[PDB]
């Protein structure tokens, strides 16, 4: 008559992720409909269909003067906790996890006078050297050149290239898996204005859209606040 | 989600005959074939297709002289722990149990000189009186007469007759269920020889084959050794 | 309503080989593909399709001089922990277990000058005597003769012959189940060279391939290191 069973040693323990609920103490509670639009099932979803300003210096944009040329314009170690990619949606989302596998996109919204032209260059430096510091060094890598004047912004896709199928959403001392490299933009042509008088500098917004192959795997509690 | 159960009071107890095994700690152990003949599934089986010498006096046989006649030749209280039926296979098997329901067979292998004849009588005395002690008393019961000379042995089936469907594999103080009676053999004709000189006595083996309707039910541990 | 159950006495115990896993605390973890070739499911597999040098003296080979003849060349008690078969893949695999049931193969890679010939004899001595010590004694058993010169190596299959369906992967004091015998090779013709000057000795490699009917059954923890 009575069934025969054996408790596992574990048995009367907790389990903070038991695939299966608990005992339904209140029942039959019918719930009212919801008419609110702008709903979501997936979080990656929102960061793909939405950019966020990267924080260069304390602002979300770099400058372009008619006295630049050689010098780098913008640089940062492509890892989801590198300075610039700190305040972004896409990067702040990440920290509920441990891993990402995606190439990112950036959009350069030039905001200088409508009598200003700046022309220009972006470059992705895979990890190896110790940060090229002149386009003449950087142009020998993957780069794109762009001429503001009629465009009114631009887009560059920093891909995913590495031996590991997933990388780290957390930066740390130089590993083959932390760093994916740098992202760089250069003054391929020092800015110009109707008068150097009226128009001193031009600027450019650096917006970060999640790439089209990007995804976060593995949820993880939050460490300490540092 | 979690199923609702209730342990019986018994619960975390032993049970030395739980119809169901235990946890298989080693698995997939394929086992090699067996080519040995003379195998068995059932124990009754072996005692049916096999006799065993009953121990009369300390030997498995009685005598037959040309000076007998009246006197009984062999007698024993038909119960599976009566003297003679002590050393037999059929009787020694029994004690792993508590009950039997079978009529027994006995075979009388006469071993006297080939110049000897003995003629003779067997008799089954159901329980009632206090042991008839002369054939003239015993022949009025169920008996069989046999003449050695050309036979070279004989067989007598001591049946099962009693009000209970099973009896006791263990003998005890006179009960309606212990004793099934006696088994007796008589000198219906005192032995004869070529010369009383050469051939003094003849003998006869008393072999016990399990009957054809005999069976043991109920296993039981062994008491003390007595 | 509530189901009735009864815990076995065992119940809240360990079990280091419970045929059944545990509670899945992390779920839905999709895993990336693997493109690495040279993969395996079964361990016997690798030792069958792969030899390993037996360690004679401290080296994996014996010699052949033009001064031998009678004397044995190589000998060892065919049991998976006998000296020579100590360093081999096939023998070192074994010790995760307790039993084997296979005939072994050996390959004799002769390495002497290309101006050298050695001719020769191998022999398997089933267990009985106390090690024959001259071919004249050994040739009366199962043996094979081989002539280097154009061959460039040789193969001998030491079979499985014994009353037990599985033997011991662990050697111990003389048992009917430990020892399967000896393996012997002889100088059926003392070596020869262009000049006894240039070519002194010839050698021969003793490689051990798992036999074609060989298998290990029963995993077992490792004892002490001795």
């Amino acid at each position: 008559a009575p069934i025969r069973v054996v408790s596992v040693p574990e048995s009367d323990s907790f389990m903070s992720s038991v695939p299966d609920n608990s005992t339904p103490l209140y029942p039959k509670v019918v719930v009212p409909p919801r008419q609110v639009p702008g709903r979501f099932t997936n979080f990656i979803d929102v960061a793909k269909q939405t950019y966020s300003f990267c924080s260069i210096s304390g602002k979300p944009y770099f400058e372009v003067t008619n006295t630049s040329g050689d010098e780098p314009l913008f640089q940062m170690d492509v890892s989801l906790s590198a300075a610039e990619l700190h305040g972004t949606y896409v990067a702040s989302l990440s920290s509920f996890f441990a891993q990402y596998r995606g190439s990112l996109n950036f959009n350069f919204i030039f905001t200088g006078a409508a009598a200003t032209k700046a022309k220009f260059l972006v470059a992705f430096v895979p990890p190896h050297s110790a940060a090229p510091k002149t386009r003449d060094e950087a142009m020998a890598c993957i780069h794109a050149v762009w001429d503001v004047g009629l465009n009114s912004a631009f887009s560059f896709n920093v891909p995913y290239s590495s031996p590991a199928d997933f990388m780290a959403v957390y930066s740390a001392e130089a590993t083959v898996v932390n760093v994916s490299g740098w992202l760089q933009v250069y003054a391929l042509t020092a800015l110009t204005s109707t008068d150097i008088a009226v128009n001193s500098k031009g600027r450019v917004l650096v917006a970060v859209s999640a790439g089209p192959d990007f995804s976060l795997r593995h949820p993880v509690d939050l460490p300490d606040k540092q | 989600a979690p199923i609702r159960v209730v342990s019986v009071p018994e619960s975390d107890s032993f049970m030395s005959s739980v119809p169901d095994n235990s946890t298989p700690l080693y698995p997939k152990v394929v086992v090699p074939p067996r080519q040995v003949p003379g195998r068995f599934t059932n124990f009754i089986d072996v005692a049916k297709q096999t006799y065993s010498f009953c121990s009369i006096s300390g030997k498995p046989y009685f005598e037959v002289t040309n000076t007998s006649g009246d006197e009984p030749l062999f007698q024993m209280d038909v119960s599976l722990s009566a003297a003679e039926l002590h050393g037999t296979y059929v009787a020694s098997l029994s004690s792993f149990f508590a009950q039997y329901r079978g009529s027994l067979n006995f075979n009388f292998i006469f071993t006297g000189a080939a110049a000897t004849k003995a003629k003779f009588l067997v008799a089954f005395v159901p329980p009632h009186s206090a042991a008839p002690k002369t054939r003239d008393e015993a022949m009025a019961c169920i008996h069989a007469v046999w003449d050695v000379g050309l036979n070279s042995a004989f067989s007598f089936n001591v049946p099962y007759s009693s009000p209970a469907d099973f009896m006791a594999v263990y003998s005890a103080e006179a009960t309606v269920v212990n004793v099934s009676g006696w088994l007796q053999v008589y000198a219906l004709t005192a032995l004869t020889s070529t010369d009383i000189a050469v051939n003094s006595k003849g003998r006869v083996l008393v072999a016990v084959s399990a009957g054809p309707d005999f069976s043991l039910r109920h296993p039981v541990d062994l008491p003390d050794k007595q | 309503a509530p189901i009735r159950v009864v815990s076995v006495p065992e119940s809240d115990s360990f079990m280091s080989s419970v045929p059944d896993n545990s509670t899945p605390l992390y779920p839905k973890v999709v895993v990336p593909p693997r493109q690495v070739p040279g993969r395996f499911t079964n361990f016997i597999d690798v030792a069958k399709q792969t030899y390993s040098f037996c360690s004679i003296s401290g080296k994996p080979y014996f010699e052949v001089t033009n001064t031998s003849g009678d004397e044995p060349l190589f000998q060892m008690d065919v049991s998976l922990s006998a000296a020579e078969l100590h360093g081999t893949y096939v023998a070192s695999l074994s010790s995760f277990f307790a039993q084997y049931r296979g005939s072994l193969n050996f390959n004799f890679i002769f390495t002497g000058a290309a101006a050298t010939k050695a001719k020769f004899l191998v022999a398997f001595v089933p267990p009985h005597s106390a090690a024959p010590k001259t071919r004249d004694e050994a040739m009366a058993c199962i043996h094979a003769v081989w002539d280097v010169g154009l061959n460039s190596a040789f193969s001998f299959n030491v079979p499985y012959s014994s009353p037990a369906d599985f033997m011991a992967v662990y050697s111990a004091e003389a048992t009917v189940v430990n020892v399967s015998g000896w393996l012997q090779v002889y100088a059926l013709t003392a070596l020869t060279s262009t000049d006894i000057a240039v070519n002194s000795k010839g050698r021969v490699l003793v490689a051990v391939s798992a036999g074609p009917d060989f298998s290990l059954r029963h995993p077992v923890d490792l004892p002490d290191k001795q």
């Binding site: 695939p19 299966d20 029942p27 019918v30 719930v31 | 989600a1 979690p2 | -």
Partner: peptide
């Protein structure tokens, strides 16, 4: 969501959870 055990519906979905419309 994280309930991939075939015992979750011991309590039918009325008692289990809620309902919309």
């Amino acid at each position: 969501g994280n309930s991939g055990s075939i015992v979750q519906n011991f309590y039918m979905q009325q008692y289990q959870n809620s309902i919309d419309a």
